[PDB]
Amino acid sequence: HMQHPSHELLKENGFTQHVYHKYRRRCLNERKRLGIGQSQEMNTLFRFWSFFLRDHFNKKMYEEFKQLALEDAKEGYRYGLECLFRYYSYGLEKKFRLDIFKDFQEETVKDYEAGQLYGLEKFWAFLKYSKAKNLDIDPKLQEYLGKFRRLE
Ligand SMILES: CN1CN([C@@H]2O[C@H](COP(=O)(O)OP(=O)(O)OP(=O)(O)O)[C@@H](O)[C@H]2O)c2nc(N)[nH]c(=O)c21
Numbered sequence: 001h002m003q004h005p006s007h008e009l010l011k012e013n014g015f016t017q018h019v020y021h022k023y024r025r026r027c028l029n030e031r032k033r034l035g036i037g038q039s040q041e042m043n044t045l046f047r048f049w050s051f052f053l054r055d056h057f058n059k060k061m062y063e064e065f066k067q068l069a070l071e072d073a074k075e076g077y078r079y080g081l082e083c084l085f086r087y088y089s090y091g092l093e094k095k096f097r098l099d100i101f102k103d104f105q106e107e108t109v110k111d112y113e114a115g116q117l118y119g120l121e122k123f124w125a126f127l128k129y130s131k132a133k134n135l136d137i138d139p140k141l142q143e144y145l146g147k148f149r150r151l152e
Contacts, residue, residue, distance in 0.1 A: 006048040015056065031068075037077030050083035054091040057100075066103065082118060085111070089122040089129075096132045105138045112144050124148050 005023040008014045023045070030039035049065040065087070069080030088104040104123065111119030124145060127135075137145075 004044065006044050009048060010051055015052070036072050036075045037079075043079050046080045046083040050087045053087055054094050057091075057095075057097070062100070066107075070107075078118075081107075081111070085119045085122040089126040092126055092132075093130045096130070101135070105141050109138060109141050109144070120144060120148070 005019060009016075009020055009023070027039065027042045027045040031042040033039075046065070046069065049061065053062055053065065065080075066084060069084040072079070073081040084107065088100070088107070092101055092104060104126070108119040108123045111117075123141070127145075
């Protein structure tokens with residue numbers, strides 16, 4: 001009776017367009033009314049996307065997740081982007097997608113150049129867990145990953 005909409009939507013047969021649309025609408029409306037980073041309901045949506053897209057990818061949903069996460073991080077509220085990096089690392093481990101991998105590299109490079117390591121650690125973690133071989137890794141990103149190689 002008290003279960004959160006995101007909890008229902010993450011069940012195997014639990015996702016329905018009707019429930020998700022009403023949930024997404026309220027979250028986005030709260031983000032606009034209360035402001036970026038000020039809506040805890042919006043944070044649950046970031047968390048939902050981070051998990052749900054691993055098993056049920058959809059281009060437009062991912063692109064909205066990505067766009068809002070980056071908007072929030074620019075304002076200084078990084079939960080959305082942390083959810084995105086977790087999606088990249090765990091999601092690409094589950095099923096590799098070339099276009100999503102390219103985004104993963106691009107956002108990791110930006111994250112590192114902004115003085116953060118959360119993205120770089122998640123990329124390094126992906127490399128340790130994934131079975132994917134012959135990856136085409138940005139030469140600049142390989143250089144950044146060199147910091148972690150000397151540590152282990
Ligand atoms: C095995 N775990 C997992 N965990 C915490 O429970 C949550 C889910 O585990 P997780 O998603 O694998 O950690 P994760 O988020 O991927 O790594 P990180 O939080 O650094 O981004 C995370 O906040 C993780 O830090 C743990 N916390 C404590 N104190 N002890 C533990 O053994 C564990």
